[PDB]
RNA sequence: ACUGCAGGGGAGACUGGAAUUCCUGGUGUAGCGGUGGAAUGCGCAGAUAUCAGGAGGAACACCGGUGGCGAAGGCGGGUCUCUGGGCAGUAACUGACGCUGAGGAGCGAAAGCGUGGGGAGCGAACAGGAUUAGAUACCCUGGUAGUCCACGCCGUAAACGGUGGGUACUAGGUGUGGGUUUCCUUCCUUGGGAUCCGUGCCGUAGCUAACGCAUUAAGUACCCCGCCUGGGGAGUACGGCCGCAAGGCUAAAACUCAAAGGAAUUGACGGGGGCCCGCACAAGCGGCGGAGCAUGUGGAUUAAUUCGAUGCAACGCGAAGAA
């Protein structure tokens, strides 16, 4: 029963899973639903098709909560994060300017070993 | 084959019903080489179905076709731990090949007599769009839709 | 000796940002994480995510390279203090004061040891999940020492250029780094030419079993030190020295075998790379394996069940005719 015209949208898209919350321009979020969140669990989650479900799932939400519009803040490397984009966009929401806010450590934290499979 | 596509047999007219249509489900029906006694069920069945409806059997079949249409398949691939399904488009021709074979297995196997009536049971059922061809259709898209995750 | 030059050479002190984690509060609800697939695990008692603030340790993206420095090991976030070495130029000074170096001494990656501190993240050991016949592993979830600091110890690495140090000589071609030098000196070009100190590649002679080396030699010579006499046993035993320990160094023998090995060639193989093809895969058509009959085979019986054949490529075969 909120009424935020204007806003912020982050997409969390990592190999396992993407994640679409949408906050107001102080990061307070509004609706933060994920690939998860609609029907979908394994694996399945990381697929494009799931990152793109979630984000419309996210927008009907911001719609129905009163978010007319949206910036977008993007990081992980995720396979999802174009079909969200476009998702968002022709689901009811404008996006305007994309940016990628991905945190790049300046050789702080050691890494884990590599895998051996 | 490895070396390009191979060109499909033409298929000629038939006199009593001037269309392709009807030789292809002689053709499909066809078995042991009696074309004379699959052409004779065929026309048993086509007969049988003008006289419960009165419209033309050809336009009667077509609708069938028509109802019976699929849209895509599930041709399943394996990569790597699991194997999966991968719903593809399929070409006219393949679809309405899929829709006769799945309309005279379901007569082959029905609960009447001979395969006039069954065949004409069978074609009107299509036809209305209630049939065993129609639910497996109906059973194939939705199977297919489930997997639309693996669109690749 | 004097004048310049470049540098992650080293030690100490102060200090900065990114990121991870954690803490507190706000927004907020049902998932998060993970894989080839999952589950263990975390959240619903408010998690993941988002914002703001704070705490803490580790490491310093971009510059960054084929580069530079250092005897080797190794060395870059920034600033300051102290300090080492090298190169170039003048020839200013001494006048063979040089080279190597048995023993000896010092330095010396990582792992490990002692004492105190610290611990974000990673992570032996360990635990659970998963794979598998088994999985004391590879994968996932966690997680202790350790990785960090201070002072000591240990002195071991494929510590490699698998090439000891010093000097003299032996065509060239082409990059890079630090200097100097006249000229082409404005042909602005910071290019070309000359010299010194390096660092790469290609290449002449020469050497080599070959691969290859080739002015940074494995070429031509000299001086000094170290090392080998077939492969295991064995760098092990005993003794000795060092070490808190782990262990390090010196270091055999009996016995056993006639090979162990280094290069290159052919072939074959690969769950290596590239291409192509086959009812080989795929779309379908008709069968076997279930039942009865005929034929051949194995086994058993008997007088023989004469005999051969035994994967695909033997099994209605030899046998196109057993009273
Ligand atoms: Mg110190
Ligand atoms: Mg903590
Ligand atoms: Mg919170
Ligand atoms: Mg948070
Ligand atoms: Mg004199
Ligand atoms: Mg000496
Ligand atoms: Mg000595
Ligand atoms: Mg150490
Ligand atoms: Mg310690
Ligand atoms: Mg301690
Ligand atoms: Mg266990
Ligand atoms: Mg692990
Ligand atoms: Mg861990
Ligand atoms: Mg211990
Ligand atoms: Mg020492
Ligand atoms: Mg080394
Ligand atoms: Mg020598
Ligand atoms: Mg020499
Ligand atoms: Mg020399
Ligand atoms: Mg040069
Ligand atoms: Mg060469
Ligand atoms: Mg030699
Ligand atoms: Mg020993
Ligand atoms: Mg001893
Ligand atoms: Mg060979
Ligand atoms: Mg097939
Ligand atoms: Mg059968
Ligand atoms: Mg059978
Ligand atoms: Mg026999
Ligand atoms: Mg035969």
């Given at each position: 029963?909120?009424?935020?015209?204007?806003?912020?949208?982050?997409?969390?898209?990592?190999?396992?899973?993407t994640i679409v919350t949408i906050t107001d321009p102080q990061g307070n979020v509004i609706a933060?639903?994920?690939?998860?969140?609609?029907?979908?669990?394994?694996?399945?989650?990381?697929?494009?098709?799931?990152?793109?479900?979630?984000?419309?799932?996210?927008?009907?939400?911001?719609?129905?909560?009163?978010?007319?519009?949206?910036?977008?803040?993007?990081?992980?490397?995720?396979?999802?994060?174009?079909?969200?984009?476009?998702?968002?966009?022709?689901?009811?929401?404008?996006?305007?300017?994309?940016?990628?806010?991905?945190?790049?450590?300046?050789?702080?934290?050691?890494?884990?070993?590599?895998?051996?499979? | 084959?490895?070396?390009?596509?191979?060109?499909?047999?033409?298929?000629?007219?038939?006199?009593?019903?001037?269309?392709?249509?009807?030789?292809?489900?002689?053709?499909?029906?066809?078995?042991?080489?009696?074309?004379?006694?699959?052409?004779?069920?065929?026309?048993?069945?086509?007969?049988?179905?003008?006289?419960?409806?009165?419209?033309d059997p050809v336009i009667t079949l077509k609708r069938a076709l028509d109802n019976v249409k699929?849209?895509?398949?599930?041709?399943?691939?394996?990569?790597?731990?699991?194997?999966?399904?991968?719903?593809?488009?399929?070409?006219?021709?393949?679809?309405?090949?899929?829709?006769?074979?799945?309309?005279?297995?379901?007569?082959?196997?029905?609960?009447?007599?001979?395969?006039?009536?069954?065949?004409?049971?069978?074609?009107?059922?299509?036809?209305?769009?209630?049939?065993?061809?129609?639910?497996?259709?109906?059973?194939?898209?939705?199977?297919?839709?489930?997997?639309?995750?693996?669109?690749?």
């Open positions: 029963k909120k009424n935020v015209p204007h806003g912020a949208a982050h997409i969390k898209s990592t190999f396992n899973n933060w639903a994920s690939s998860g969140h609609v029907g979908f669990k394994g694996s399945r989650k990381s697929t494009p098709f799931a990152a793109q479900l979630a984000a419309e799932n996210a927008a009907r939400k911001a719609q129905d909560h009163g978010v007319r519009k949206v910036d977008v803040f993007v990081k992980g490397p995720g396979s999802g994060r174009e079909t969200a984009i476009r998702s968002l966009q022709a689901a009811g929401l404008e996006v305007g300017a994309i940016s990628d806010v991905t945190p790049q450590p300046h050789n702080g934290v050691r890494p884990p070993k590599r895998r051996r499979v | 084959p490895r070396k390009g596509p191979a060109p499909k047999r033409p298929l000629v007219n038939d006199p009593v019903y001037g269309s392709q249509l009807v030789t292809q489900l002689v053709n499909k029906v066809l078995l042991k080489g009696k074309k004379s006694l699959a052409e004779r069920i065929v026309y048993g069945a086509l007969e049988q179905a003008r006289d419960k409806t009165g419209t699929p849209a895509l398949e599930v041709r399943s691939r394996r990569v790597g731990g699991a194997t999966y399904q991968v719903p593809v488009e399929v070409r006219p021709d393949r679809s309405t090949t899929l829709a006769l074979r799945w309309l005279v297995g379901y007569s082959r196997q029905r609960r009447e007599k001979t395969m006039i009536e069954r065949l004409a049971n069978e074609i009107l059922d299509a036809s209305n769009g209630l049939g065993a061809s129609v639910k497996r259709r109906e059973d194939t898209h939705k199977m297919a839709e489930a997997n639309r995750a693996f669109a690749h």
